[PDB]
Amino acid sequence: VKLFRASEPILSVLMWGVNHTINELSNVPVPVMLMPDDFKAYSKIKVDNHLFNKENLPSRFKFKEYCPMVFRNLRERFGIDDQDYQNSVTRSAPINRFLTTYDRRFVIKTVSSEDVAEMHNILKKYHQFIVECHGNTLLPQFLGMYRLTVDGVETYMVVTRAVFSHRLTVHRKYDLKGVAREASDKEKAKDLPTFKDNDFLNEGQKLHVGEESKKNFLEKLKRDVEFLAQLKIMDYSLLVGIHDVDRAEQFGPGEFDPSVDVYAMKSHESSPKKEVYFMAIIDILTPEQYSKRFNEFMSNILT
Amino acid sequence: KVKLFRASEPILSVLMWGVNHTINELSNVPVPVMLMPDDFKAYSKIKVDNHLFNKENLPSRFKFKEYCPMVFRNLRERFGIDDQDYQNSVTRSAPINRFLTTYDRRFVIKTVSSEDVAEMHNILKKYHQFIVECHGNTLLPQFLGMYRLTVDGVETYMVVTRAVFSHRLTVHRKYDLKGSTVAREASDKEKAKDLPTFKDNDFLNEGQKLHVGEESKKNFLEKLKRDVEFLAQLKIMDYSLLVGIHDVDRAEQEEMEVEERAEDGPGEFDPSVDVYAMKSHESSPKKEVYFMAIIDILTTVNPEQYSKRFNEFMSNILT
Numbered sequence: 189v190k191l192f193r194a195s196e197p198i199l200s201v202l203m204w205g206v207n208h209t210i211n212e213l214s215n216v217p218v219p220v221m222l223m224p225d226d227f228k229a230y231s232k233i234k235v236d237n238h239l240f241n242k243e244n245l246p247s248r249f250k251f252k253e254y255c256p257m258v259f260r261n262l263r264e265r266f267g268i269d270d271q272d273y274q275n276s277v278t279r280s281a282p283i284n285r286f287l288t289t290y291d292r293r294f295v296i297k298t299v300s301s302e303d304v305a306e307m308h309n310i311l312k313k314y315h316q317f318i319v320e321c322h323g324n325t326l327l328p329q330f331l332g333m334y335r336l337t338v339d340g341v342e343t344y345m346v347v348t349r350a351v352f353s354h355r356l357t358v359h360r361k362y363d364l365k366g367v368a369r370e371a372s373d374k375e376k377a378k379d380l381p382t383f384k385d386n387d388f389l390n391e392g393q394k395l396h397v398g399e400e401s402k403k404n405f406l407e408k409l410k411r412d413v414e415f416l417a418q419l420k421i422m423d424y425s426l427l428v429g430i431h432d433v434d435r436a437e438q439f440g441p442g443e444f445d446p447s448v449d450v451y452a453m454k455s456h457e458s459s460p461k462k463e464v465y466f467m468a469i470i471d472i473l474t475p476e477q478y479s480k481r482f483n484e485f486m487s488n489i490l491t
Numbered sequence: 492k493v494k495l496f497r498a499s500e501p502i503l504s505v506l507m508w509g510v511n512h513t514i515n516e517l518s519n520v521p522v523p524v525m526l527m528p529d530d531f532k533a534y535s536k537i538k539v540d541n542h543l544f545n546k547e548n549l550p551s552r553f554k555f556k557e558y559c560p561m562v563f564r565n566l567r568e569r570f571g572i573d574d575q576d577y578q579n580s581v582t583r584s585a586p587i588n589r590f591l592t593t594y595d596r597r598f599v600i601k602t603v604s605s606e607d608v609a610e611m612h613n614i615l616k617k618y619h620q621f622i623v624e625c626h627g628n629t630l631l632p633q634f635l636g637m638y639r640l641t642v643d644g645v646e647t648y649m650v651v652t653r654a655v656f657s658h659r660l661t662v663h664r665k666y667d668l669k670g671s672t673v674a675r676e677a678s679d680k681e682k683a684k685d686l687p688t689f690k691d692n693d694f695l696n697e698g699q700k701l702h703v704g705e706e707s708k709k710n711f712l713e714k715l716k717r718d719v720e721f722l723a724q725l726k727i728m729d730y731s732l733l734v735g736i737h738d739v740d741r742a743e744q745e746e747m748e749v750e751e752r753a754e755d756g757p758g759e760f761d762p763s764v765d766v767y768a769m770k771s772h773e774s775s776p777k778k779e780v781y782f783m784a785i786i787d788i789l790t791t792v793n794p795e796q797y798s799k800r801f802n803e804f805m806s807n808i809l810t
């Protein structure tokens with residue numbers, strides 16, 4: 189019995205809409221292939237409830253879903269079950285726009301009109317890419333794209349699989365791009381410090397994962413950025429989280445489900461401090477240069 | 492469990508889609524202690540524009556409105572009808588035969604007029620209290636839902652009721668009795684249908700009677716007494732007693748014949764489902780089952796008189 193109780197009507201509508209659309213798709217046969225129109229399709233539903241159901245939801249709102257067939261396919265290829273997705277969004281209000289489902293499994297980012305256009309611009313090539321690499325990638329995993337309309341105001345959203353574990357606490361992150369980029373004094377003091385490539389290399393920090401993972405990671409990181417190039421995109425960073433097992437050891441720690449924390453990596457026997465690294469590409473909605481720059485700076489962290 | 496909402500017509504798919512949607516949505520709406528006045532003025536509305544998507548059964552574009560959802564959900568409980576049953580009878584397969592039945596013959600679906608929908612609202616408060624204080628014991632139409640559908644910009648109003656006739660037992664002869672002293676009979680046209688809707692004078696000139704037995708006669712005339720007064724307390728006139736007669740032996744042969752036709756219990760029912768049904772007195776000529784209800788209450792004579800007249804006719808119809 190979902191109330192869609194949220195700190196904000198936009199959120200409730202989001203819960204309502206994700207619920208509605210996922211349900212609706214369950215009466216829609218999974219097809220043998222996606223079609224060209226699927227990339228131009230959408231669903232729109234306008235609600236107008238006079239004097240009814242007003243406790244959590246607005247009375248009047250719109251909810252549009254972009255390319256529901258493509259994104260539903262994307263979910264499967266990413267090994268995400270629609271009813272899990274749905275339950276993550278609808279069972280409890282997402283939290284802190286940049287949100288996560290209450291179970292830290294999915295991220296919900298507000299985006300712009302042009303973001304949504306760029307998404308449409310690259311979606312067929314990105315689907316084709318997901319297919320070809322069998323969903324094995326460091327790229328953002330796009331699960332859904334929506335436009336909510338509440339009080340006349342349109343709001344765009346994009347849902348990705350979270351980068352950081354939904355369980356194992358991160359203790360240090362690093363937004364990396366491969367100029368001058370450090371952490372500002374106005375940020376350097378906070379529960380979660382978001383670093384950058386300068387404060388990293390100068391910090392003599394490395395990620396010890398074994399040559400066996402360097403092989404998977406790089407062999408992926410290469411085809412991924414090569415793909416972003418051919419799409420003539422740039423400014424994408426490499427989000428990197430560290431989880432020192434001890435700091436939290438203070439059921440087991442360092443324990444995680446690779447099928448859920450898809451971005452996680454164990455350190456190697458032949459390594460110093462014992463930790464879990466979370467690594468993926470972020471911010472891809474916007475040269476062969478940026479690519480090879482990126483690739484190089486990131487190869488150097490993997491020993 | 493895929494519901495395609497496949498139907499011989501867009502309108503029907505939309506109906507299936509709408510009843511499905513509204514019932515699920517209600518399922519997330521807690522059950523109220525009491526109804527509030529606003530609940531009688533309330534409605535839900537949804538408009539769908541699906542572009543290049545989900546077009547194989549549903550239209551791409553449509554509207555679905557439900558009137559006073561809270562009140563009809565309650566009317567449903569008060570008639571011992573479960574929402575999920577209702578939803579399933581409407582959605583599991585297309586309604587069939589502006590009169591429709593659900594694929595399983597439990598519920599009737601009338602296409603009504605804007606006028607009719609309008610009269611529903613007038614009487615909706617007073618109707619609900621009536622059902623409350625008769626605990627659901629009435630020969631009156633039992634209203635389960637009212638909706639407006641929009642397909643191709645065209646608006647169709649529907650009212651859902653419980654079916655008067657048994658979902659199982661075949662009807663072999665039906666009547667529409669009023670009592671009006673004008674001439675009511677069956678046209679030579681109707682007369683030559685399969686199941687002619689016979690009228691007052693036919694029932695009389697046929698000398699028909701229904702042998703229900705006294706315990707049953709009293710309870711029926713008591714329902715009817717309070718039912719037709721309530722109607723009179725409103726402007727309401729010209730409504731009817733729908734009378735179905737089921738012949739148990741005749742059905743038993745018909746069944747027998749249907750088995751040998753394909754290859755190449757009898758007389759009983761659930762009074763919690765077939766709510767209008769009555770068994771014939773064990774001292775009856777033929778073994779029969781009757782179905783008796785009031786119908787058409789929405790759309791030199793007057794209400795109070797009609798009630799007294801209608802009541803007196805029906806009471807002289809049974810023994």
Ligand SMILES: Nc1nc2c(ncn2[C@@H]2O[C@H](COP(=O)(O)O)[C@@H](O)[C@H]2O)c(=O)[nH]1
Binds near residue numbers: 533605609
């Ligand atoms: N009394 C009453 N009539 C209504 C109400 N809502 C709609 N109606 C009537 O029902 C019919 C259909 O209205 P619609 O829903 O298409 O606007 C019209 O006769 C309209 O005036 C209501 O809340 N109260």
Ligand SMILES: Nc1nc2c(ncn2[C@@H]2O[C@H](COP(=O)(O)O)[C@@H](O)[C@H]2O)c(=O)[nH]1
Binds near residue numbers: 532609613
């Ligand atoms: N759409 C709508 N129609 C109404 C409403 N209330 C009354 N009506 C319409 O306007 C008329 C008013 O009649 P009354 O309220 O005096 O019985 C009714 O015939 C009905 O069709 C309402 O709240 N909404």
Ligand SMILES: Nc1nc2c(ncn2[C@@H]2O[C@H](COP(=O)(O)O)[C@@H](O)[C@H]2O)c(=O)[nH]1
Binds near residue numbers: 744748
């Ligand atoms: N009343 C009655 N009629 C029967 C019975 N068996 C057959 N008939 C009727 O006799 C005719 C021929 O029956 P058939 O054996 O060809 O089904 C049909 O009109 C059929 O309905 C029966 O047991 N009772």
